[PDB]
Design a protein around this nucleic acid. Structure first.
Ligand SMILES: [Mg+2]
Ligand SMILES: [Mg+2]
Ligand SMILES: [Mg+2]
Ligand SMILES: [Mg+2]
Ligand SMILES: [Mg+2]
Ligand SMILES: [Mg+2]
Ligand SMILES: [Mg+2]
Ligand SMILES: [Mg+2]
Ligand SMILES: [Mg+2]
Ligand SMILES: [Mg+2]
Ligand SMILES: [Mg+2]
Ligand SMILES: [Mg+2]
Ligand SMILES: [Mg+2]
Ligand SMILES: [Mg+2]
Ligand SMILES: [Mg+2]
Ligand SMILES: [Mg+2]
Ligand SMILES: [Mg+2]
Ligand SMILES: [Mg+2]
Ligand SMILES: [Mg+2]
Ligand SMILES: [Mg+2]
Ligand SMILES: [Mg+2]
Ligand SMILES: [Mg+2]
Ligand SMILES: [Mg+2]
Ligand SMILES: [Mg+2]
Ligand SMILES: [Mg+2]
Ligand SMILES: [Mg+2]
Ligand SMILES: [Mg+2]
Ligand SMILES: [Mg+2]
Ligand SMILES: [Mg+2]
Ligand SMILES: [Zn+2]
Lengths: 103, 64, 189, 57, 75, 68, 141, 143, 55, 145
RNA sequence: CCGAUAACGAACGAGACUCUGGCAUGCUAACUAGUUACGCGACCCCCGAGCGGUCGGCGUCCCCCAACUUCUUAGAGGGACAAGUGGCGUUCAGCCACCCGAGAUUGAGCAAUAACAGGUCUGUGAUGCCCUUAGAUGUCCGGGGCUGCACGCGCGCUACACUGACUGGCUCAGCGUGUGCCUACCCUACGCCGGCAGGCGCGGGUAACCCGUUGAACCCCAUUCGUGAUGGGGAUCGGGGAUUGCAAUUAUUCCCCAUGAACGAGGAAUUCCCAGUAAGUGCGGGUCAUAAGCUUGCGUUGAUUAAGUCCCUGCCCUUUGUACACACCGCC
């Protein structure tokens, strides 16, 4: 029995809210004490570009941005039964990274 | 020598006149002979129902 | 009842002219402690008329770009200037201020379409809000220009503008450019 | 250019599309460039629905 | 208005004029008595505060940008 | 001012009136809920802007025979 | 001992969340008292609800406010509706509604902003000029 | 009936702690306090012959509120506008070895103390002195 | 050649030793977040990297 | 705030080769002396024990002479070495505070030093131009037609 | 849009949509966010007080040795639609006022057809023809130039001061970045030495974890100054001290002491702007070994005036005139 922390990072929330809810009820069905999904503040990345290949124009900038959503789940589980909980929902936009308990 | 300053309430606002649209028309009463009424042209924001402050009177108006 | 600036009562002042009684804004209901409020009086036409006249005086004093958002600087300027009015005269400055709005708002102005060699063409009446808009504007300009490089402080030149304006002298900057507007309007009536 | 771009256009529409618009631009014959476009049907242009209703190339 | 250049450490014809007629009238401020007699400007911040040692002057405001004084209490 | 409805609101409400007049009323918050029961409206702002025009017609066709 | 609500008030960013226990007349901000607060030309704007309501309304509560964010002036206004919504919300749960209704009709009829916040935050800056609406100077020739 | 330093006038409180450190002549004043300028975003070394006591007063009083402040944090508190001549102004941070010589001047007076983390706090010897004269300021503000 | 002075000037710091990863150009480069692309070649791959013009 | 006025209130002074104003305060009166600025005058009146609230017409000549004595050679009165004007003189090796026409000499002796050597900085003083790397395309149209 | 109707049914655009701002004491939850309770540990009045006051002091995940989610974060829904009331209208589409409410028009993003000899071949291993190819217009290295100045013009920054400079004290932000495939160059706490720029040690942080509770500036409070080209203004200029780098002279930047120029609010013109807007005021990001008077974002203090008009400058639709179609910079 450990105190492990799974971290879930994604770029779209509707593809992450399905994966993060899969890990909660996936461990409520397997009767673990699960601290709920804790939602970190998002990370918007805001490259702004001149939009013109030359320098001629009316100076119209070009605001690109990319939000990064990060949610983390803390468990109360041993090292074995979490592996079939981890390896059942990839959903390629989500990067599930499981940390270690002791640290 | 001068005519006394006679006050005057304002009936309906009748639109905006003046080249740049600065002046309205107000069709005042006098609050002394309320049967008597003269259309005039104020400048500034009006709010129909207020009281003006006219000096001399018997001026003019051109109906818009 | 409310004692604006902590020490100036308001249920004794009288308005002279019947016209400006709904645009001069000192009496019973909306008389506050301080002339500083999160206003929201610019969102609607004529919402600035039920704005208290001491709030309006502070809002027009922070104007030449040097001091443009500095309101808490011009809260005390009107605060100090009221204590100078009390010492120079011996009277409630809320009375002295509303006798200055009367005696400095013009009653006649000029504008219309065509040629203008000196000012304008047609004699036009003045609504009783622009003569509250402009009477505050003249008292804030006579205060500002008198103390531009003089030894006198700004609350002195604010007091000495409207002590001399509420009396009626043509020795203040306001009445000098109040009768300048109605003289030239009497010219091209 | 014309004969080929018809055959692509009525291959898109017969394959169940809702609308198509193929634009071919460049040195069409002569030296001065012109542009032949081939709109038919239905093509939204503005909003969020031009992110997942219309695929471009 | 050409030049002012006047007064520092009062001459006696103005200091005797200071200690008599300046505690008499209504508005006492270092900007209104500086222009008044001839006192430069600093003297009036320094003279009018040592008349609060003699007590012929009543304090009103005492702000960092303006110090308002007045005539002493009569009644 | 500037809130004149378009014809994705008007002609999509005259289908609701002509087909579901018995299931409606002169009450906005009920017909806001009836309209999402009987129609697939993709957005919430278009939803209750139709239903705001559905209630304008039913204080209207209870006086005269408006189309209809 | 649980007679304690905690409400907040905001002004442009700055939330100021009060806390009123059951006690005797105490009112203070961040430890500092109600009069020893900052720039003090706005002092009649922060002890304003204590004046026109009275001291007997505040006689049973222990107002304690904590303030973060904002500037110097949009902090006086945050406390201003923090210490005055804490008295309104305390009087709906622990005394009768008729006594709340006769002090809400004091704080609304005189400066409505004492109980409702302003929805104005800050508009965004654009790539045209130096600020939101203003634009850079244009030279025709 | 307290009181502490929180419920008194903070600006007058400094003028009293500077006088309290004056007559108790154990505060080690360094030998260049009359030729140093005090944090290069300002000219003209100050209009006070004994400015070191008012800086040691406020520094001590600033340590009573937020503890754990080192020499870099005290440079942040006493910084301001550097008017760059013709260029626009900037916040530029204060002077390092005038805040260090203040914090070292109270290590010998037994008012400050190094910590488990960085910076300095007030020792219980120290806030005994600040809270006592806070009653002396409030006793004069009623008069 | 030869080896001692063919490329001897140090291509450390400076925009002579930073090139676009797509087009090998040294002007108008975006090095923020480790893009290391030019400002025009970013706008081709702006969506393929995953940036969205929301406002 | 004096008694009335000092009886020997001297109206101006005359110190090295300049006539400083007697009505100024003493920390700003002696800044009329070249080589002595607002930062150097405030430290040479702390080496002297005089107060600064006095103006320049109240210092007795037993105190005026020491003010000249501090400023003429400051390094022997514990004024620190980073504070001077001419540190490491290009012809002496001596940290010195020039405060007279010797400041006008040193200025002139180093301009004609660079011209006699004929360096690049000295040619742009012989020519009425800018020296410190400025751009001359659109700046400097007041000192020339 | 309502209607009208030789037209009928549609399509793009507008709107919808998207992101964002405002509202939720209701929901989901939080040792990488907290808040109250309570326990110790410091201080202060004390005669002794006390369910006293202060604390960004400590602790409640070595398994309870306490619970909660208002504040913080971001998920899912709600919420506002001219719906209610009065007035005018063909009583149509709608408009104005008003109540209740967080709000009765928050800002942007996307954006049709038809064009243009508009800008870019110096963004591209996008490219046609042409030119040049070994004494090369390929590429490298060393030095110089792009910055040179009688002058004209455009965007700016700092100013002409007392509604201020100066000094000391006091006291609040929000966006956001941070060790890099090549690639060397990260944000930095704390301790000591130096007056300052900076140096030497020891750490933390691949980040809601550390810088950081981002102790930002203006503002506020107190002193000095006193209408003087003044303690306004800081250009020009000499000497010195460091940092980056292979290298600082034609001065990289920064610090110190001196030098103290015009400039007293601006001619004809003319440019932006109507609400958290203008303006003041600082902070990030981009460029960056060194670096912002630039730009792109962010907060902060916070108005005057206006809720109109077609007079000027233009734009859209209709009728009309035309010898115009290279389209009034026309033709003649
Ligand atoms: Mg003045
Ligand atoms: Mg569309
Ligand atoms: Mg749209
Ligand atoms: Mg701005
Ligand atoms: Mg500071
Ligand atoms: Mg803990
Ligand atoms: Mg626990
Ligand atoms: Mg919450
Ligand atoms: Mg061309
Ligand atoms: Mg190209
Ligand atoms: Mg080619
Ligand atoms: Mg490029
Ligand atoms: Mg070369
Ligand atoms: Mg160039
Ligand atoms: Mg430009
Ligand atoms: Mg200066
Ligand atoms: Mg924050
Ligand atoms: Mg000067
Ligand atoms: Mg070189
Ligand atoms: Mg360079
Ligand atoms: Mg200097
Ligand atoms: Mg930078
Ligand atoms: Mg640039
Ligand atoms: Mg308009
Ligand atoms: Mg027109
Ligand atoms: Mg046209
Ligand atoms: Mg004809
Ligand atoms: Mg025709
Ligand atoms: Mg011809
Ligand atoms: Zn590229």
């Amino acid at each position: 029995i450990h105190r492990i922390r799974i971290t879930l990072t994604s770029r779209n929330v509707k593809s992450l809210e399905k994966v993060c809810a899969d890990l909660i009820r996936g461990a409520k069905e397997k009767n673990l004490k699960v601290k709920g999904p804790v939602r970190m503040p998002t990370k918007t990345l805001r490259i702004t570009t001149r939009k013109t290949p030359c320098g001629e124009g009316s100076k119209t900038w070009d605001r690109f941005q990319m939000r990064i959503h990060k949610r983390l789940i803390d468990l109360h589980s041993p090292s074995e039964i979490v592996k079939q909980i981890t390896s059942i929902s990839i959903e390629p936009g989500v990067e599930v990274e499981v940390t270690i308990a002791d640290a | 020598r001068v005519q006394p300053i006679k006050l005057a309430r304002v009936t309906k606002v009748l639109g905006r006149t003046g080249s740049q649209g600065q002046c309205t028309q107000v069709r005042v009463e006098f609050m002394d002979d309320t049967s008597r009424s003269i259309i005039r042209n104020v400048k500034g924001p009006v709010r129909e129902g207020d009281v003006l402050t006219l000096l001399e009177s018997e001026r003019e108006a051109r109906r818009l | 009842d409310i004692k604006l600036f902590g020490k100036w009562s308001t249920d004794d002042v009288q308005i002279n002219d019947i016209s400006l009684q709904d645009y001069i804004a000192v009496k019973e209901k909306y008389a506050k402690y301080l002339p500083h409020s999160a206003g929201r009086y610019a969102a609607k036409r004529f919402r600035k008329a039920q704005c208290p006249i001491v709030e309006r005086l502070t809002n027009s004093m922070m104007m030449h770009g040097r001091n443009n958002g500095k309101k808490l600087m011009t809260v005390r300027i009107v605060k100090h200037a009221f204590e100078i009015i009390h010492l120079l005269t011996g009277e409630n400055p809320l009375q002295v201020l509303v006798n200055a709005i009367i005696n400095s708002g013009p009653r006649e102005d000029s504008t219309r379409i065509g040629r203008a060699g000196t000012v304008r063409r047609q004699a036009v009446d003045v609504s009783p809000l622009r003569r509250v808009n402009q009477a505050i504007w003249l008292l804030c300009t006579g205060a500002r220009e008198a103390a531009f490089r003089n030894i006198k402080t700004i609350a002195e030149c604010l007091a000495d503008e409207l002590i001399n304006a509420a009396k009626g002298s043509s020795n203040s900057y306001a009445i000098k450019k109040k009768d300048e507007l109605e003289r030239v309007a009497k010219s091209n009536r | 250019v014309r004969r080929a771009c018809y055959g692509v256009l009525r291959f898109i529409m017969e394959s169940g599309a809702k609308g198509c618009e193929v634009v071919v631009s460049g040195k069409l014959r002569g030296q001065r460039a012109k542009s032949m476009k081939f709109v038919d049907g239905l093509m939204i242009h503005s909003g969020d629905p031009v992110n997942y209703y219309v695929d471009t190339a | 208005r050409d030049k002012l250049n006047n007064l520092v450490l009062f001459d006696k014809a103005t200091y005797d004029k200071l200690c008599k007629e300046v505690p008499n009238y209504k508005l006492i401020t270092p900007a209104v008595v500086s222009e008044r007699l001839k006192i430069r400007g600093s003297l009036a911040r320094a003279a009018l505060q040592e008349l609060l040692s003699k007590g012929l002057i009543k304090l009103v405001s005492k702000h960092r940008a303006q110090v308002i004084y007045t005539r002493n209490t009569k009644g | 001012m500037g809130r004149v409805r378009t014809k994705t609101v008007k002609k999509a409400a005259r289908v609701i009136i002509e087909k579901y007049y018995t299931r409606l009323g002169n009450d906005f918050h009920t017909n806001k809920r009836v309209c999402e029961e009987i129609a697939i409206i993709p957005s919430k702002k278009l939803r209750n802007k139709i239903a705001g025009y559905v209630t304008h017609l039913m204080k209207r066709i209870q006086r005269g025979p408006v189309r209809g | 001992p649980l007679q304690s609500v905690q409400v907040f008030g905001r002004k442009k960013t700055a939330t100021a969340v009060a806390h009123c226990k059951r006690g005797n007349g105490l009112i203070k901000v961040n430890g500092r008292p109600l009069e020893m607060i900052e720039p003090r030309t706005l002092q009649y704007k922060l002890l304003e609800p204590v004046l026109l309501l009275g001291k007997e309304r505040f006689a049973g509560v222990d107002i304690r406010v904590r303030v973060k964010g904002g500037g110097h002036v949009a902090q006086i206004y945050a406390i201003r509706q923090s210490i005055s919504k804490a008295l309104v919300a305390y009087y709906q749960k622990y005394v009768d509604e008729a006594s709340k209704k006769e002090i809400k009709d004091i704080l609304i009829q005189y400066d409505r902003t004492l109980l409702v916040a302003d929805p104005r935050r800050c508009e965004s800056k654009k790539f045209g000029g130096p600020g939101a609406r203003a634009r850079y100077q244009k030279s025709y020739r | 009936p307290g009181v502490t330093v929180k419920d008194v006038n903070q600006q007058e409180f400094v003028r009293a702690l500077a006088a309290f450190l004056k007559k108790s002549g154990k505060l080690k004043v360094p030998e260049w306090v009359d030729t140093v300028k005090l944090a290069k975003h300002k000219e003209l070394a100050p209009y006070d012959e004994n400015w070191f006591y008012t800086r040691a007063a406020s520094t001590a009083r600033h340590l009573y509120l937020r503890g754990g402040a080192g020499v870099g944090s005290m440079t942040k508190i006493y910084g301001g506008r550097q008017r760059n001549g013709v260029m626009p102004s900037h916040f530029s941070r204060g002077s390092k070895s005038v805040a260090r010589r203040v914090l070292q001047a109270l290590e010998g007076l037994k008012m400050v103390e190094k910590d488990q983390d960085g910076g300095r706090k007030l020792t219980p010897q120290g806030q005994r002195d600040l809270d006592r004269i806070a009653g002396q300021v409030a006793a004069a503000n009623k008069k | 050649g030869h080896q001692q002075l063919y490329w001897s000037h140090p291509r450390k710091f400076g925009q002579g030793s930073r090139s676009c990863r797509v087009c090998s150009n040294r002007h108008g480069l975006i090095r923020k977040y480790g893009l290391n692309m030019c400002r025009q070649c970013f706008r081709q791959y702006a969506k393929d990297i995953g940036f969205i013009k929301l406002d | 705030m004096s008694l009335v006025i000092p009886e020997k209130f001297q109206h101006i002074l005359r110190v090295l080769n300049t006539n400083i104003d007697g009505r100024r305060k003493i920390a700003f009166a002696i800044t009329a002396i070249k080589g002595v600025g607002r930062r150097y005058a405030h430290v040479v009146l702390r080496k002297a024990d005089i107060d600064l609230t006095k103006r320049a017409g109240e210092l007795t000549e037993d105190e005026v002479e020491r003010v000249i004595t501090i400023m003429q050679n400051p390094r022997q009165y514990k004024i620190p070495d980073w504070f001077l004007n001419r540190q490491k003189d290009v012809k002496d090796g001596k940290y010195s505070q020039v405060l007279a026409n010797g400041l006008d000499n040193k200025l002139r002796e180093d301009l004609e030093r660079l011209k006699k050597i004929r360096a690049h900085r000295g040619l742009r003083h012989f020519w009425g131009l800018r020296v410190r790397g400025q751009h001359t395309k659109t700046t400097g149209r007041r000192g020339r037609t």
